[PDB]
Structures are given as structure tokens and as C-alpha cells.
């Protein structure tokens with residue numbers, strides 16, 4: 001199997017998580033952010049992630065990829081219950097986290113931005129949809145306060161460091177990518193159960209945190 005991604009893309013992280021949790025090899029390939037030709041040839045639209053199955057078929061959609069991979073060996077791991085409280089929290093934080101993440105992604109040394117044109121493509125598309133990056137960065141301290149406050153609420157919902165609801169579930173798939181990407185945001189106050197879950201799930205999934213790149 002092969003997986004076509006951007007390193008910053010949370011949907012790509014979801015797909016990467018199931019390969020890491022099950023110790024399944026996969027050939028990761030980062031596409032440039034301005035590359036429409038490759039994904040459109042594969043799945044008829046420009047988006048990532050894209051899985052190539054062993055028989056050469058290409059398949060988009062992070063949660064279809066997660067479901068497919070988790071069933072291959074007949075022993076799915078994502079058997080635990082989801083939590084309405086976690087869904088509510090993610091609904092709230094996914095409503096604004098991009099205001100912190102997008103301007104920081106755009107400055108950072110991710111492979112999908114390795115040409116000037118690919119980085120500029122991201123900046124121009126995302127300033128159009130999310131707003132002027134200088135203005136988003138001007139509001140960093142208020143947005144960091146908001147994240148830190150919301151992380152204190154999440155802290156009470158982290159049942160175990162290895163699984164947000166106590167048994168591995170799709171809520172780990174939905175939550176970890178956001179926490180991983182938030183480690184790029186210098187200044188966040190991380191509560192202890194959230195921090196332990198972040199670190200434990202990074203190890204289980206073999207996905208790097210971005211703490212060393214934080215800005």
C-alpha cells in the first residue's frame with residue numbers, strides 16, 4: 001500500500017494513525033501543495049489523503065482508508081465507544097484552531113511547501129478562505145488563551161493516556177491529529193492528561209510531534 005499526503009494535513013494524519021497503531025508498512029509520499037495533476041489522475045479530484053491499494057486502485061477519504069486498513073487482518077483495533085462530549089469539544093475547537101495553525105504551517109519546513117510555488121499556493125488559498133495571516137497572527141495570544149482554556153475542559157475527558165475514552169476508538173483518530181498539529185503553536189498551556197495522551201498516542205502511532213518546530 002502507498003499513501004499520498006501532506007505532512008500538516010489532519011486527514012492525512014488520521015490515515016497514518018491506523019498504519020502506526022497496527023504496525024502495517026506503507027509507502028508515504030508527500031505531494032507538493034500546488035500539485036493538482038497527481039491527485040486528480042488518481043481519484044478525479046485534488047485532495048489528500050489518497051491510498052493506493054495493493055491491486056493499484058486509488059481510494060480517497062481519510063475515514064474510508066482508516067476503516068479499510070483496520071479490517072484487513074480481521075482484527076479491528078477501533079472497537080471502543082466514541083463520546084458525545086468529545087464530539088462537542090472537537091466541534092468547538094475545529095471552529096477556530098485553523099486561525100492558529102494555518103499561518104504557522106505556511107512558515108514552516110513541511111515537505112509539501114518545499115517549492116516557493118507550493119508554499120505560495122497554500123498561503124493564497126488559505127488567506128482567501130481563513131483570512132489575512134498577519135491579522136490571524138496578531139490575534140495569537142487571544143487564540144492561545146482560547147485553546148489553553150478549551151484544553152483544560154478536554155483534560156477532564158481523557159480517560160487513559162493510551163485511549164481518550166479508555167479503549168481505542170474513532171475519537172482517537174479524530175482528536176490526536178489536532179493535538180499533534182497544535183504542538184506547532186508556541187505558548188499553549190498543556191494540561192497533564194492531555195499532554196500524556198498526546199505523547200502516548202504519538203508513540204503508538206509513530207507520528208512525530210512538532211514541538212521542536214513550534215512558533
Ligand SMILES: N[C@@H](CCC(=O)N[C@@H](CS)C(=O)NCC(=O)O)C(=O)O
Pocket residue numbers: 006008009010011012033046047048049060061062063
Ligand atoms: N473528506 C476528506 C478531507 C480531506 C481534505 O480536506 N484534505 C485537504 C488537506 S488537509 C486538501 O486535500 N484540500 C485540498 C487541497 O489541498 O487542494 C478526507 O477525510 O480525507
